[PDB]
Design a protein around this ligand. Structure first.
Ligand SMILES: NC(=O)c1ccc[n+]([C@@H]2O[C@H](COP(=O)([O-])OP(=O)(O)OC[C@H]3O[C@@H](n4cnc5c(N)ncnc54)[C@H](O)[C@@H]3O)[C@@H](O)[C@H]2O)c1
Ligand SMILES: NC(=O)c1ccc[n+]([C@@H]2O[C@H](COP(=O)([O-])OP(=O)(O)OC[C@H]3O[C@@H](n4cnc5c(N)ncnc54)[C@H](O)[C@@H]3O)[C@@H](O)[C@H]2O)c1
Lengths: 203, 203
DNA sequence: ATTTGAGAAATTTATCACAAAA
DNA sequence: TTTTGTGATAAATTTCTCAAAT
């Protein structure tokens, strides 16, 4: 499966949830492409990699395709997350997941600063000492670790998660993590610098 | 300019700053590829698009190439940013830029909630009423707007920024913004769902 | 002795076109 | 009356060679 497909699959997934909220039961690839700003052929091709969910001369059943993509994306289950780093980013993600997301459940947040190791970072979430990270991940079968520590300590924390059996890592620190589990990176500063690149190109 | 180049250029830029902090004056493309986990040929190709910064049989002057990429990225200037939305994401980005970044200066943050209007979101940064957004952007020549409002209000905020002369937008809301200025998106939930995709694929 | 950079090839991704179903 | 889905084309991206500098 081509690399850019997974990203577009997530976009189709959110769009289908919107159509369900609107009451739409059937949608064509051209109607989907019209509101995502993509070519209908690309949408049909990407879905081709995983199966035949369409009805020739009719379209796609919104609920069936939504459920199908959800199964492919692994979203049909609840994912247990831990946040390492109770700073700006760590608390922002903790307060959001507990509130807005129902498929991702943050059950722990960790820090190394004695001032924060006792404070509450989100509703029903008390900051734990990072010394307990491995024990917590193994005991509660945590599956996703979000790294929100400075770059100088991201790799070390990444290896502890992988050692404790983490299945994947969401990395916010501006460094390339080296581990055997999947890693998605969110580099805010890199995005700004990609933005300035495009800005000066237009000028 | 191929699409993936700008992203890798930002990666070379951070790596070169690290080499400067280490005292390295000259570096080969193979040494750069060694610390970025890329092929040396790719690094040389990407640099080819913008000029000839290397010394045949020698390598690249670290400081000269750093300055060259910095000029291409548009980082040799100070960029004025405003944050719309003083929530979790908005406050996290405000406190970081004011503290950690020297090339991006957040000079304003805006919200529509009377409870937060007037409050301080970061050192020396007081939340302003979003009704003043356009006026602020025009007067102070703000160049980059960071959108940290719920998805239902992202497009409307994007159009006000573009109307006030904003040059680019960093978008955190899970929706595709439609404007004539460049837009870089950071979709945290989409990243998690791309991560779950990779997790269930491997296993 | 090395190491960059300019074609050329190889690889990957997007787009098209149309028969096949409903 | 139409729209999905498969092959094939087309386009974009990555990788490879190696002459030319040093
Ligand atoms: N906040 C932003 O907008 C932003 C922007 C760009 C990049 N980043 C990057 O995201 C990451 C976190 O950003 P932030 O704003 O939250 O910084 P922050 O200083 O507010 O929070 C970092 C937290 O990590 C803790 N920490 C440090 N070492 C630790 C360790 N071994 N174990 C456990 N905890 C540890 C610290 O106690 C601190 O609380 C950083 O790598 C940063 O470079 C953030
Ligand atoms: N916090 C996360 O980790 C996370 C994760 C996924 C997605 N997001 C998305 O990022 C965006 C912001 O996230 P958040 O956690 O900070 O939400 P938040 O509730 O913590 O803060 C959002 C702020 O936007 C303000 N607002 C609403 N409408 C406004 C308007 N017209 N003008 C000005 N201000 C307005 C609100 O007063 C609020 O303070 C959202 O779109 C969210 O879906 C965030």
């Amino acid at each position: 499966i081509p690399k850019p497909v997974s990203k577009r699959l997530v976009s189709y997934y959110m769009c289908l949830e919107r159509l369900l909220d609107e009451g739409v039961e059937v949608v064509s690839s051209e109607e989907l492409a019209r509101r995502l700003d993509l070519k209908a052929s690309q949408i049909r091709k990407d879905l081709s990699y995983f199966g035949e969910f369409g009805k020739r001369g009719v379209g796609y059943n919104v609920e069936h395709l939504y459920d199908a993509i959800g199964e492919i994306l692994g979203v049909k289950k609840e994912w247990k997350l831990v946040v390492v780093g109770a700073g700006n980013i760590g608390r922002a993600v903790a307060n959001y997941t507990v509130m807005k997301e129902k498929g991702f459940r943050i059950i722990g947040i960790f820090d190394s600063d004695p001032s924060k190791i006792g404070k509450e970072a989100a509703p029903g979430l008390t900051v734990s000492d990072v010394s307990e990270l491995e024990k917590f991940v193994e005991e509660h079968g945590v599956e996703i670790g979000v790294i929100a520590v400075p770059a100088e300590h991201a790799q070390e924390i990444a290896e502890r998660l992988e050692k404790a059996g983490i299945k994947g890592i969401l990395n916010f620190a501006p460094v390339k993590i080296k581990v055997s589990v999947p890693v998605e990176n969110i580099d805010i500063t890199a995005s700004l610098r990609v933005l300035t690149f495009e800005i000066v190109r237009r000028n």
